[PDB]
Amino acid sequence: GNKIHPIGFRLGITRDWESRWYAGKKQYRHLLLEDQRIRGLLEKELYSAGLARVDIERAADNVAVTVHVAKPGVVIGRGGERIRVLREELAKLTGKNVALNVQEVQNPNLSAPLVAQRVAEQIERRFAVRRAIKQAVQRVMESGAKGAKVIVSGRIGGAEQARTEWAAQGRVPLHTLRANIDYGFALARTTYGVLGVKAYIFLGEV
RNA sequence: CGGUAAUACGGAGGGCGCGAGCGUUACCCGGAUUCACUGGGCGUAAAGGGCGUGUAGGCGGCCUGGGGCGUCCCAUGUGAAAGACCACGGCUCAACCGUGGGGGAGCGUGGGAUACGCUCAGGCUAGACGGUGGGAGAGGGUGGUGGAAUUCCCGGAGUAGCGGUGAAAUGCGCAGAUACCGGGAGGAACGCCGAGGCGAAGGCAGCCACCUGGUCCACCCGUGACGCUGAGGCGCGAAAGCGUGGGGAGCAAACCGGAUUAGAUACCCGGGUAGUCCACGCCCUAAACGAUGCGCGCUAGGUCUCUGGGUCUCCUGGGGGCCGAAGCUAACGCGUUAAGCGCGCCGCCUGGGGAGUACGGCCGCAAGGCUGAAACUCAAAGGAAUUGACGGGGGCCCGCACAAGCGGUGGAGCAUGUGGUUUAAUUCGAAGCAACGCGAAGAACCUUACCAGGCCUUGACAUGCUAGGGAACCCGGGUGAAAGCCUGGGGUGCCCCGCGAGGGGAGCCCUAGCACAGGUGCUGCAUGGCCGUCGUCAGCUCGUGCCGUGAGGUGUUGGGUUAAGUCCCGCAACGAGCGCAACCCCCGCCGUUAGUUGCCAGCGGUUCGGCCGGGCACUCUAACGGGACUGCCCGCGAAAGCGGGAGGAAGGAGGGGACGACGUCUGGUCAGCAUGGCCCUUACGGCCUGGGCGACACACGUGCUACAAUGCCCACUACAAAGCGAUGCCACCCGGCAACGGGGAGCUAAUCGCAAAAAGGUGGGCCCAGUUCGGAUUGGGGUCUGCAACCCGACCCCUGAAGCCGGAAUCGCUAGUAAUCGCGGAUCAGCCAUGCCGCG
RNA sequence: GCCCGGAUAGCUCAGGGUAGAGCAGGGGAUUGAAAAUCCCCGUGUCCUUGGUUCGAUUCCGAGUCCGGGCACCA
RNA sequence: AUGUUC
Numbered sequence A: 001g002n003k004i005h006p007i008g009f010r011l012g013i014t015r016d017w018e019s020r021w022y023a024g025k026k027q028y029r030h031l032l033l034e035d036q037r038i039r040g041l042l043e044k045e046l047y048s049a050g051l052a053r054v055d056i057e058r059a060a061d062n063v064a065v066t067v068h069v070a071k072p073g074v075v076i077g078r079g080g081e082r083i084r085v086l087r088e089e090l091a092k093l094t095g096k097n098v099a100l101n102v103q104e105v106q107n108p109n110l111s112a113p114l115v116a117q118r119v120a121e122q123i124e125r126r127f128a129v130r131r132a133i134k135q136a137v138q139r140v141m142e143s144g145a146k147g148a149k150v151i152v153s154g155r156i157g158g159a160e161q162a163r164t165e166w167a168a169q170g171r172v173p174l175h176t177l178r179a180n181i182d183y184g185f186a187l188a189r190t191t192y193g194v195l196g197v198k199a200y201i202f203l204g205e206v
Numbered sequence B: 001c002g003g004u005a006a007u008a009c010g011g012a013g014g015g016c017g018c019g020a021g022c023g024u025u026a027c028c029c030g031g032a033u034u035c036a037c038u039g040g041g042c043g044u045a046a047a048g049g050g051c052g053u054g055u056a057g058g059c060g061g062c063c064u065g066g067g068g069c070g071u072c073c074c075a076u077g078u079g080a081a082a083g084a085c086c087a088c089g090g091c092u093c094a095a096c097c098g099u100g101g102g103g104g105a106g107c108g109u110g111g112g113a114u115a116c117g118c119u120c121a122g123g124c125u126a127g128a129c130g131g132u133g134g135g136a137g138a139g140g141g142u143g144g145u146g147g148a149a150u151u152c153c154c155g156g157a158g159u160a161g162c163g164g165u166g167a168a169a170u171g172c173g174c175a176g177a178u179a180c181c182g183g184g185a186g187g188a189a190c191g192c193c194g195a196g197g198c199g200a201a202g203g204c205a206g207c208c209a210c211c212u213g214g215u216c217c218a219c220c221c222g223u224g225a226c227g228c229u230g231a232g233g234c235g236c237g238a239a240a241g242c243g244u245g246g247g248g249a250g251c252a253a254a255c256c257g258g259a260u261u262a263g264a265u266a267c268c269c270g271g272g273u274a275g276u277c278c279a280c281g282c283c284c285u286a287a288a289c290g291a292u293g294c295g296c297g298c299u300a301g302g303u304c305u306c307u308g309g310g311u312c313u314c315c316u317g318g319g320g321g322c323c324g325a326a327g328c329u330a331a332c333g334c335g336u337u338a339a340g341c342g343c344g345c346c347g348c349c350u351g352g353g354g355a356g357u358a359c360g361g362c363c364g365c366a367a368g369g370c371u372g373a374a375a376c377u378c379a380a381a382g383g384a385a386u387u388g389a390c391g392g393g394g395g396c397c398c399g400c401a402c403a404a405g406c407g408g409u410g411g412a413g414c415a416u417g418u419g420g421u422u423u424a425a426u427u428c429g430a431a432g433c434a435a436c437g438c439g440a441a442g443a444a445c446c447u448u449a450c451c452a453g454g455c456c457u458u459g460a461c462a463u464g465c466u467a468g469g470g471a472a473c474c475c476g477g478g479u480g481a482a483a484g485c486c487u488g489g490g491g492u493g494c495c496c497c498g499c500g501a502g503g504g505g506a507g508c509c510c511u512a513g514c515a516c517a518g519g520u521g522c523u524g525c526a527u528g529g530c531c532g533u534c535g536u537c538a539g540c541u542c543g544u545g546c547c548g549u550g551a552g553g554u555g556u557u558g559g560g561u562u563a564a565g566u567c568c569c570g571c572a573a574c575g576a577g578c579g580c581a582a583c584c585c586c587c588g589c590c591g592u593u594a595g596u597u598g599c600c601a602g603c604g605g606u607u608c609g610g611c612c613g614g615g616c617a618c619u620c621u622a623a624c625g626g627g628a629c630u631g632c633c634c635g636c637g638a639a640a641g642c643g644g645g646a647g648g649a650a651g652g653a654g655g656g657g658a659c660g661a662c663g664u665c666u667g668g669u670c671a672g673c674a675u676g677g678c679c680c681u682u683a684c685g686g687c688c689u690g691g692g693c694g695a696c697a698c699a700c701g702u703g704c705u706a707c708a709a710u711g712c713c714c715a716c717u718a719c720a721a722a723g724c725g726a727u728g729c730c731a732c733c734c735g736g737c738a739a740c741g742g743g744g745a746g747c748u749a750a751u752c753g754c755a756a757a758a759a760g761g762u763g764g765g766c767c768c769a770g771u772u773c774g775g776a777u778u779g780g781g782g783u784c785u786g787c788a789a790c791c792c793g794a795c796c797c798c799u800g801a802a803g804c805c806g807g808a809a810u811c812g813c814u815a816g817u818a819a820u821c822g823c824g825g826a827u828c829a830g831c832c833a834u835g836c837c838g839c840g
Numbered sequence C: 001g002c003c004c005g006g007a008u009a010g011c012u013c014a015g016g017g018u019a020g021a022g023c024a025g026g027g028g029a030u031u032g033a034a035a036a037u038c039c040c041c042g043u044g045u046c047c048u049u050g051g052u053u054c055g056a057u058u059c060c061g062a063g064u065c066c067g068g069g070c071a072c073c074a
Numbered sequence D: 001a002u003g004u005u006c
């Protein structure tokens, strides 16, 4: 029981909110709830698209949602039919009118959430974990990270004895607060239960 | 292997291997260099005999000759056939068979060779012995005799204790001890010298004499291989022990007493018999050890030391040590004093246990010794080194760890969590630290997981399919504690055939049917996620190099320094990473920006409160900056750093946060959530009313209030900070002793409100008392929240418990800390909050 | 008879204002647990009688029952 | 001085 959330630890400094609206005591409750049914819906529908973030701004009580995906192709559709329904789905579940923008994650191999998702997906499909891990870290570093770490939880290869295979390269100065360590976490659901996957990508300083 | 995902069980499919076969068991060889001739070993793994002496035996320097036994050569005989091997052939092949061919050690016979081994003969002098001359020595034996000490006896002198331990007592002592002195006895051992020396081993220590063994050196004088080893045999063999005698001071198994202890048949104390001593005779063992058989040769050196010799600053011999060449070694280590390189000879080993046991035999007075198995059993036993961890090991070093302090807990009441008991239920989890005011940041119903009873089933919730009706919605009627069951009505916007009949229609809702939902049911060793914890401890690693057969090591052992693997110095390492620190927030000094709702210094006015003008200066607010870095000075130091000083609001990490390395704990959580697997399906799901989680003979944790005078009560008067609030904070009136109730402004809040801060200060009262201390308990009468306060709420208003500072123990804190005093918040209708998180 | 002493909790024993250790039970405390160890409980006609005293288990005098020693018993 | 166990 230790190591605090490398995002939570940064926030004001180095790394920004995933939702930036204001609301007073009477309001926050309901907009936060929305935010959440929003993220939740997009979290499962845009799985194939490899989504890293779901940033949510909110102004004249109107809602813009930026979805930072690796595969905008997938969220869009051929000529944008899929993103049609997506804009209508959100509107169905929120009593409101919601801008849904896409944004290509330029390099998906520096997106901790994606790197993490990829390894998780690999595991879900009976891939060797140690290798999967080690490779993920090679990909991250090749893509110019100053350092990267990846951690698969336990029940690797299906064992009775749960474990925790880690693997890392470069600097990952978690105590350093100017660092800019993206962090990411996906599940592997398996016949044999869940393994969790943590990726840390270190990108630079100041 | 098998514990609920089993490539190891059983079956299936699939595969691999052989195939008229494939497996099994048994036995032999192999692997097994694990009986080692080829081809092993004995320092610590199993293995050097306890040491001499020596018999058989094994082995034997240099030269010359004779012999020709070994040995080698040639011929020749023999080595039957079959088999084996080569060729060619017969059965259609092959198996099987034929024919021919080459082998083959052995042994006989003849002839020959003579290097080596043997043998006979002669020779040599390098091995061995001897002569002469010198030497060192706890080598042995017998005799004596010297002083110190202990004990005892006789005295003297002197008196109250001595002795002894962790502490004591036993014991000795007034019948005179202990300490001191004189006289004497007797036994044992020899201080200093003293570390080395001698001996084959065991072992050997005052001095003197006699007897006696080994050994070294020199001259190079004599003999001339006379040598090495040595199964047996013979002798020697520590200590204990045995027999007969002696002797007996000190010591001291056993034993007796005293302690210690749970016991103490021990360790500590006081005594004490064998024995320890001597003679003679036995015993024959041992960690009898260098755990290393003896002899010889050969392979760098350095250094200390004993003892000889030397035209003596070094050489030369013999011993004893330490370090090391090459080499060996599993490693440790050994290394001209070999565990190296070699030859001779002896001894011994062959997994562990059983067991040095049994049986037998030999020896012994006995104790016992020697020789020495097997059954059965295990899958190891084991050596060395490595990384850890551990220590009632060491050094160095840290933390409120102790210590120094100050205040508490443990006692009392009560609050609260827990054990337990109880109950229909008292849901469930947390268990040393790191469970127990913990999950719970809010249990009357709800919560709520439990109990009772009454009710519901495609369901309180989801996705979707079939179908007559209904298709939104909304209202009452019975029966009920409520759920629910039964009921009767108001009444179709919408897509659309349409100008309508009438008729398609999608939401949506009920009925039945189908899939499915639901499960706080189990497993925290199936899990994720999150957390605790060691520990904010100073660590944990890596890349390449180098060291090691290797695990691994170095780096990161050392010296200094730091809060720190912080830094410095050093170094077969040079770097790096996760940690430390820094980057982030708060607090402390100042600046710039900004001037309302905040401030009010100087004005002017004034119903006093900055109220109005003005103004933002100061205070604030809050955003951005500056500022500290051992930077400067002195001293110490090689440096890092340290001591001190100055300036500065602030130093030596300025004070607090946030922050928790690789890992540990099969830690915690399936009951927050997620999740594999297991389980429930008119019930383990779901709804309700009521009860319970609040029970109380007990025990424990954390707290609160106290026991009072540095106090308590009443009046009056001050000085905060951080928060919170528009179905809420509530000013201010009024009524009420009061909780509160009626009114009722202001406040989307730097505006108005909660708000009184309390301790403090000033008055007064109490006068040491179970009290004007303390406020438990209990009776009544009220208030408020809420459908409802019986179990079970808080608050107000009129009994007055225990408790006179708390046993063994035990906690917190190092400075704006502890101690004490209040204030706010989350949860929340209300509150059992004395808790928690914060604020001053 | 005479002189001495004893009688205290269930047992074994300590002692002018006051009743105690010990053993056994039970709570605690210590330990990570368990033992060992430490602490706290509840227990009396203080033999009986009269005296002294404000107070007696304590001092006095008597008496009973024991123990020691000595008398002696019609 | 002593001071056991899992």
Ligand SMILES: [Mg+2]
Pocket: B032
């Ligand atoms: Mg063999």
Ligand SMILES: [Mg+2]
Pocket: B040, B041
């Ligand atoms: Mg061998």
Ligand SMILES: [Mg+2]
Pocket: none
């Ligand atoms: Mg051994």
Ligand SMILES: [Mg+2]
Pocket: none
């Ligand atoms: Mg051995």
Ligand SMILES: [Mg+2]
Pocket: none
């Ligand atoms: Mg020997």
Ligand SMILES: [Mg+2]
Pocket: none
């Ligand atoms: Mg001979």
Ligand SMILES: [Mg+2]
Pocket: none
């Ligand atoms: Mg001769």
Ligand SMILES: [Mg+2]
Pocket: B220
């Ligand atoms: Mg001569």
Ligand SMILES: [Mg+2]
Pocket: none
């Ligand atoms: Mg002997």
Ligand SMILES: [Mg+2]
Pocket: none
């Ligand atoms: Mg002897």
Ligand SMILES: [Mg+2]
Pocket: none
């Ligand atoms: Mg004798």
Ligand SMILES: [Mg+2]
Pocket: none
């Ligand atoms: Mg005897």
Ligand SMILES: [Mg+2]
Pocket: none
């Ligand atoms: Mg003794």
Ligand SMILES: [Mg+2]
Pocket: none
């Ligand atoms: Mg031996």
Ligand SMILES: [Mg+2]
Pocket: B335
């Ligand atoms: Mg050496």
Ligand SMILES: [Mg+2]
Pocket: none
């Ligand atoms: Mg026998």
